[PDB]
Amino acid sequence: PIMLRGGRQEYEPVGPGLIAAWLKQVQEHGLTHPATITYFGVISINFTSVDINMLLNVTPGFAAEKQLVIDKIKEKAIAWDEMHPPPPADAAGPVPLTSDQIRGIGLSPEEAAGPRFADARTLYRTWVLEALQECQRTISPLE
Amino acid sequence: PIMLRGGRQEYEPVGPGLIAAWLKQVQEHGLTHPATITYFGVISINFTSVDINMLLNVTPAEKQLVIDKIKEKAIAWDEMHPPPPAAAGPVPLTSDQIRGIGLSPEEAAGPRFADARTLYRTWVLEALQECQRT
């Protein structure tokens, strides 16, 4: 995540405590349970695309649900690229981004935390939350 | 909302209890707060487009931004989908139809709009998310 420290923007990777806490939330309630989706919304504020993929990728199980969520992200990326062809290399900025760039594909954590990707990481978080929301599980009776 | 009762589909309008509960959520927590977006997601399953508009319309800046985003999606939809040859079904819809404009509550609950209400619910969820700031 990006955070203000001593007045300046700094980047730090997701900490082991948050990874552990997110994993417990998923295990206890489910990946697409409404409370889990809200939880992801709260924690992922100011995450880079690399941070987001980190949390998605370390989540075990829920293969079916996770696959449906990833499928919806891919659908958004496909739609994005159709509406936004990539510009020539040395075109005047701010240069708009491809879906791969928005999703943090091939980016170092440092790169993904840079100003070039500030709007992009916000947009990717939006795509992921939209995908989760669209796969929301209706709450059912517990054991 | 559309629900199964005695094994068949039935329609009923949104009730005052749900309206009151939704209003409390928005007042107490905010229109685009993560928990409010989730709350809308829960309550709007099987809503028609008319039901969704009832909830939007009863909700007192941020609301205008959400409506603006829905309009942007409508404009994009219509560019990509010229009105079908005035032809065999299933007939694909205009953004006005998806948004439930000019539909009676009964009409909006019909099979002709079953996919459409689902798509509109998606547009609204997307609009809320895209307007989220805090």
Short mmCIF file of C-alpha atoms in Angstrom, two decimals:
data_model
loop_
_atom_site.label_atom_id
_atom_site.label_comp_id
_atom_site.label_asym_id
_atom_site.label_seq_id
_atom_site.Cartn_x
_atom_site.Cartn_y
_atom_site.Cartn_z
CA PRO A 1 0.00 0.00 0.00
CA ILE A 2 0.83 3.70 -0.39
CA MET A 3 0.71 5.69 2.81
CA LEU A 4 1.60 9.13 4.09
CA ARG A 5 4.56 9.05 6.46
CA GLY A 6 6.22 12.21 7.71
CA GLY A 7 4.04 14.04 5.21
CA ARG A 8 5.28 12.13 2.13
CA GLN A 9 3.94 9.22 0.08
CA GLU A 10 5.78 5.99 0.86
CA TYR A 11 5.25 2.44 -0.37
CA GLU A 12 5.35 -0.72 1.72
CA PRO A 13 4.31 -4.23 0.72
CA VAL A 14 1.31 -5.87 2.37
CA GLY A 15 2.36 -7.00 5.85
CA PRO A 16 2.20 -10.57 7.16
CA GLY A 17 -0.46 -9.58 9.72
CA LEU A 18 -2.83 -8.32 7.06
CA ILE A 19 -2.20 -11.34 4.85
CA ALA A 20 -3.01 -13.62 7.79
CA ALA A 21 -6.10 -11.59 8.70
CA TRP A 22 -7.45 -11.57 5.13
CA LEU A 23 -6.92 -15.32 4.87
CA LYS A 24 -8.82 -15.95 8.13
CA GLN A 25 -11.68 -13.76 6.86
CA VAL A 26 -11.92 -15.81 3.66
CA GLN A 27 -11.60 -19.16 5.42
CA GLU A 28 -14.20 -18.27 8.04
CA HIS A 29 -16.83 -16.65 5.82
CA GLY A 30 -16.00 -17.33 2.16
CA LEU A 31 -14.43 -15.30 -0.64
CA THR A 32 -17.66 -13.89 -2.10
CA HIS A 33 -19.66 -13.68 1.11
CA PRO A 34 -20.96 -10.09 1.42
CA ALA A 35 -18.97 -9.40 4.61
CA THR A 36 -15.77 -10.57 2.90
CA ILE A 37 -16.35 -8.26 -0.08
CA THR A 38 -16.85 -5.29 2.26
CA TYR A 39 -13.68 -6.35 4.12
CA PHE A 40 -11.69 -6.39 0.90
CA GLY A 41 -13.06 -2.93 0.06
CA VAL A 42 -11.88 -1.55 3.41
CA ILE A 43 -8.37 -3.02 3.39
CA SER A 44 -7.51 -2.37 -0.25
CA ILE A 45 -7.70 1.39 -0.11
CA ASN A 46 -4.43 2.72 -1.54
CA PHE A 47 -3.24 -0.74 -2.62
CA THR A 48 -1.24 -0.97 -5.83
CA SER A 49 -2.25 -3.50 -8.49
CA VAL A 50 0.66 -5.68 -7.34
CA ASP A 51 -0.65 -5.56 -3.74
CA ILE A 52 -4.14 -6.56 -4.94
CA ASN A 53 -2.83 -9.49 -6.95
CA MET A 54 -0.74 -10.56 -3.99
CA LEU A 55 -3.81 -10.94 -1.78
CA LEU A 56 -5.83 -12.63 -4.52
CA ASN A 57 -3.02 -15.05 -5.33
CA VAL A 58 -2.35 -16.18 -1.76
CA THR A 59 -5.99 -17.06 -1.18
CA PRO A 60 -6.36 -20.88 -1.13
CA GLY A 61 -9.47 -22.86 -2.02
CA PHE A 62 -12.68 -21.32 -3.34
CA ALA A 63 -11.44 -22.27 -6.81
CA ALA A 64 -14.90 -22.06 -8.39
CA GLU A 65 -15.75 -18.71 -6.81
CA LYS A 66 -12.30 -17.30 -7.41
CA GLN A 67 -12.43 -18.43 -11.04
CA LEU A 68 -15.76 -16.66 -11.52
CA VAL A 69 -14.28 -13.46 -10.05
CA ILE A 70 -11.16 -13.66 -12.23
CA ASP A 71 -13.36 -14.33 -15.25
CA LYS A 72 -15.23 -11.07 -14.62
CA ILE A 73 -11.97 -9.12 -14.26
CA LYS A 74 -10.82 -10.55 -17.60
CA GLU A 75 -14.10 -9.53 -19.19
CA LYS A 76 -13.57 -5.95 -17.99
CA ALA A 77 -10.01 -5.99 -19.31
CA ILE A 78 -11.17 -7.25 -22.72
CA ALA A 79 -13.82 -4.51 -22.85
CA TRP A 80 -11.27 -1.89 -21.80
CA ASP A 81 -8.76 -2.80 -24.50
CA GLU A 82 -11.41 -2.74 -27.23
CA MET A 83 -12.37 0.82 -26.25
CA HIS A 84 -8.80 2.02 -25.63
CA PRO A 85 -6.09 1.14 -28.16
CA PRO A 86 -2.49 1.79 -26.99
CA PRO A 87 -0.68 4.99 -28.12
CA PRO A 88 2.74 5.19 -29.84
CA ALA A 89 5.74 4.90 -27.51
CA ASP A 90 6.76 8.56 -27.27
CA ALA A 91 3.32 10.21 -27.25
CA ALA A 92 2.64 13.23 -25.02
CA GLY A 93 1.51 12.43 -21.47
CA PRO A 94 -0.31 11.58 -19.40
CA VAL A 95 -0.18 8.34 -21.38
CA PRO A 96 -3.31 6.18 -20.80
CA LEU A 97 -2.75 2.53 -20.01
CA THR A 98 -3.47 -0.95 -21.35
CA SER A 99 -5.49 -3.40 -19.29
CA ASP A 100 -2.30 -5.39 -18.62
CA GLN A 101 -0.74 -2.27 -17.10
CA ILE A 102 -3.88 -1.48 -15.11
CA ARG A 103 -3.83 -5.06 -13.72
CA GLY A 104 -0.14 -4.71 -12.76
CA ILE A 105 1.08 -7.40 -15.15
CA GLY A 106 4.86 -7.34 -15.50
CA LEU A 107 5.25 -4.52 -12.99
CA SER A 108 7.74 -4.51 -10.13
CA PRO A 109 6.24 -3.50 -6.78
CA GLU A 110 8.19 -0.23 -6.99
CA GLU A 111 6.99 0.43 -10.53
CA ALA A 112 3.37 -0.25 -9.59
CA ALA A 113 3.63 2.26 -6.73
CA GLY A 114 4.74 5.10 -9.02
CA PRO A 115 2.74 8.18 -10.07
CA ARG A 116 2.30 6.79 -13.59
CA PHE A 117 0.01 4.15 -12.07
CA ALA A 118 -1.82 6.20 -9.39
CA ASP A 119 -5.10 6.41 -11.26
CA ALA A 120 -4.53 2.90 -12.67
CA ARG A 121 -4.35 1.16 -9.29
CA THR A 122 -7.55 2.96 -8.30
CA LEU A 123 -9.23 1.70 -11.47
CA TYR A 124 -7.99 -1.86 -10.94
CA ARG A 125 -9.33 -1.89 -7.38
CA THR A 126 -12.65 -0.76 -8.85
CA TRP A 127 -12.60 -3.65 -11.36
CA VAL A 128 -11.82 -6.22 -8.65
CA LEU A 129 -14.50 -4.94 -6.29
CA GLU A 130 -17.04 -4.83 -9.14
CA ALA A 131 -16.15 -8.44 -10.00
CA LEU A 132 -16.54 -9.58 -6.40
CA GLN A 133 -19.83 -7.71 -6.03
CA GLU A 134 -21.19 -9.34 -9.20
CA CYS A 135 -20.38 -12.79 -7.76
CA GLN A 136 -21.89 -12.04 -4.34
CA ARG A 137 -23.09 -15.16 -2.52
CA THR A 138 -26.55 -15.07 -0.98
CA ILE A 139 -26.17 -15.73 2.74
CA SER A 140 -27.26 -19.20 3.76
CA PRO A 141 -27.93 -21.04 7.02
CA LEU A 142 -24.75 -21.82 8.96
CA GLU A 143 -23.89 -25.13 10.64
CA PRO B 1 -38.85 -7.67 -6.32
CA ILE B 2 -39.53 -11.00 -8.01
CA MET B 3 -39.74 -14.01 -5.74
CA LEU B 4 -40.81 -17.64 -5.81
CA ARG B 5 -44.02 -18.28 -3.86
CA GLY B 6 -45.76 -21.64 -4.03
CA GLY B 7 -43.18 -22.60 -6.64
CA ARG B 8 -44.01 -19.82 -9.11
CA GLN B 9 -42.65 -16.35 -9.82
CA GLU B 10 -44.54 -13.45 -8.23
CA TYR B 11 -43.90 -9.71 -8.20
CA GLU B 12 -44.37 -7.24 -5.36
CA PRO B 13 -43.29 -3.59 -5.12
CA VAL B 14 -40.53 -2.50 -2.78
CA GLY B 15 -42.01 -1.95 0.68
CA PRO B 16 -41.70 0.85 3.26
CA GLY B 17 -39.71 -1.41 5.58
CA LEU B 18 -36.98 -1.94 3.01
CA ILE B 19 -37.06 1.72 1.99
CA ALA B 20 -36.69 2.76 5.64
CA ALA B 21 -33.82 0.30 6.15
CA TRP B 22 -32.00 1.40 2.99
CA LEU B 23 -32.37 5.08 3.94
CA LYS B 24 -30.94 4.37 7.40
CA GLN B 25 -27.95 2.59 5.86
CA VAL B 26 -27.20 5.53 3.55
CA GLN B 27 -27.73 8.16 6.26
CA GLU B 28 -25.71 6.35 8.90
CA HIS B 29 -22.86 5.06 6.71
CA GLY B 30 -22.81 6.87 3.31
CA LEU B 31 -24.02 6.13 -0.25
CA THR B 32 -20.70 4.81 -1.63
CA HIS B 33 -19.14 3.37 1.53
CA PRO B 34 -18.00 -0.23 0.99
CA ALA B 35 -20.64 -1.58 3.36
CA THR B 36 -23.42 0.41 1.64
CA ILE B 37 -22.47 -0.90 -1.79
CA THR B 38 -22.57 -4.42 -0.38
CA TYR B 39 -25.90 -3.66 1.28
CA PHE B 40 -27.34 -2.50 -2.03
CA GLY B 41 -26.00 -5.67 -3.63
CA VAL B 42 -27.80 -7.84 -1.07
CA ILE B 43 -31.17 -6.11 -1.19
CA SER B 44 -31.36 -5.64 -4.97
CA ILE B 45 -31.15 -9.30 -6.01
CA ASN B 46 -34.18 -9.96 -8.18
CA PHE B 47 -35.20 -6.28 -8.28
CA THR B 48 -36.67 -5.01 -11.53
CA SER B 49 -35.33 -1.80 -13.06
CA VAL B 50 -38.39 0.01 -11.71
CA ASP B 51 -37.63 -1.31 -8.21
CA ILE B 52 -34.02 -0.13 -8.50
CA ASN B 53 -35.20 3.34 -9.57
CA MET B 54 -37.61 3.46 -6.64
CA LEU B 55 -34.68 3.00 -4.27
CA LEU B 56 -32.52 5.55 -6.08
CA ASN B 57 -35.34 8.07 -6.25
CA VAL B 58 -36.19 7.84 -2.55
CA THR B 59 -32.54 8.50 -1.68
CA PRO B 60 -31.92 12.22 -0.94
CA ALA B 61 -22.96 15.74 -4.81
CA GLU B 62 -22.41 11.98 -4.49
CA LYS B 63 -25.84 10.84 -5.64
CA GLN B 64 -25.57 13.05 -8.72
CA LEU B 65 -22.16 11.57 -9.52
CA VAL B 66 -23.61 8.04 -9.36
CA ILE B 67 -26.50 9.00 -11.66
CA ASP B 68 -23.98 10.65 -14.02
CA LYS B 69 -22.01 7.38 -14.20
CA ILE B 70 -25.17 5.41 -15.02
CA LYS B 71 -25.85 7.85 -17.87
CA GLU B 72 -22.30 7.34 -19.19
CA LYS B 73 -22.88 3.59 -19.29
CA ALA B 74 -26.20 4.19 -21.07
CA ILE B 75 -24.50 6.35 -23.73
CA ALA B 76 -21.79 3.74 -24.27
CA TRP B 77 -24.41 0.98 -24.51
CA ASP B 78 -26.42 2.77 -27.16
CA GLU B 79 -23.36 3.47 -29.32
CA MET B 80 -22.41 -0.21 -29.32
CA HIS B 81 -25.99 -1.42 -29.76
CA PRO B 82 -28.08 0.30 -32.43
CA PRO B 83 -31.80 -0.49 -32.00
CA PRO B 84 -32.37 -3.93 -33.55
CA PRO B 85 -34.25 -4.11 -36.86
CA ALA B 86 -37.77 -3.12 -35.76
CA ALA B 87 -37.31 -8.65 -36.03
CA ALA B 88 -37.23 -12.07 -34.35
CA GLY B 89 -36.54 -12.37 -30.63
CA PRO B 90 -35.03 -12.36 -28.20
CA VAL B 91 -34.95 -8.64 -28.97
CA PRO B 92 -31.90 -6.85 -27.49
CA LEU B 93 -32.74 -3.67 -25.63
CA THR B 94 -32.01 0.05 -25.64
CA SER B 95 -30.47 1.71 -22.60
CA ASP B 96 -33.83 3.35 -21.83
CA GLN B 97 -35.38 -0.13 -21.64
CA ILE B 98 -32.53 -1.50 -19.50
CA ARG B 99 -32.99 1.49 -17.15
CA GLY B 100 -36.75 0.81 -16.96
CA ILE B 101 -37.74 4.20 -18.40
CA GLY B 102 -41.44 4.38 -19.25
CA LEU B 103 -42.08 0.88 -17.90
CA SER B 104 -44.97 0.06 -15.59
CA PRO B 105 -43.96 -2.09 -12.62
CA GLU B 106 -45.68 -5.13 -14.19
CA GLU B 107 -44.00 -4.62 -17.57
CA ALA B 108 -40.58 -4.33 -15.91
CA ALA B 109 -41.17 -7.66 -14.16
CA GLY B 110 -41.79 -9.49 -17.45
CA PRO B 111 -39.49 -12.10 -19.05
CA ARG B 112 -38.62 -9.61 -21.81
CA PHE B 113 -36.62 -7.69 -19.20
CA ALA B 114 -35.27 -10.55 -17.06
CA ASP B 115 -31.71 -10.19 -18.30
CA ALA B 116 -32.11 -6.41 -18.56
CA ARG B 117 -32.87 -5.90 -14.86
CA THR B 118 -29.78 -7.97 -14.05
CA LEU B 119 -27.66 -5.80 -16.31
CA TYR B 120 -29.10 -2.57 -14.84
CA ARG B 121 -28.32 -3.82 -11.33
CA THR B 122 -24.74 -4.31 -12.55
CA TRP B 123 -24.63 -0.74 -13.94
CA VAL B 124 -25.76 0.67 -10.59
CA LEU B 125 -23.29 -1.42 -8.59
CA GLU B 126 -20.53 -0.28 -10.97
CA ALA B 127 -21.61 3.36 -10.70
CA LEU B 128 -21.51 3.25 -6.88
CA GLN B 129 -18.04 1.69 -6.91
CA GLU B 130 -16.69 4.14 -9.47
CA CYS B 131 -17.86 7.05 -7.27
CA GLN B 132 -16.33 5.69 -4.09
CA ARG B 133 -13.73 8.00 -2.53
CA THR B 134 -13.34 7.08 1.14
#
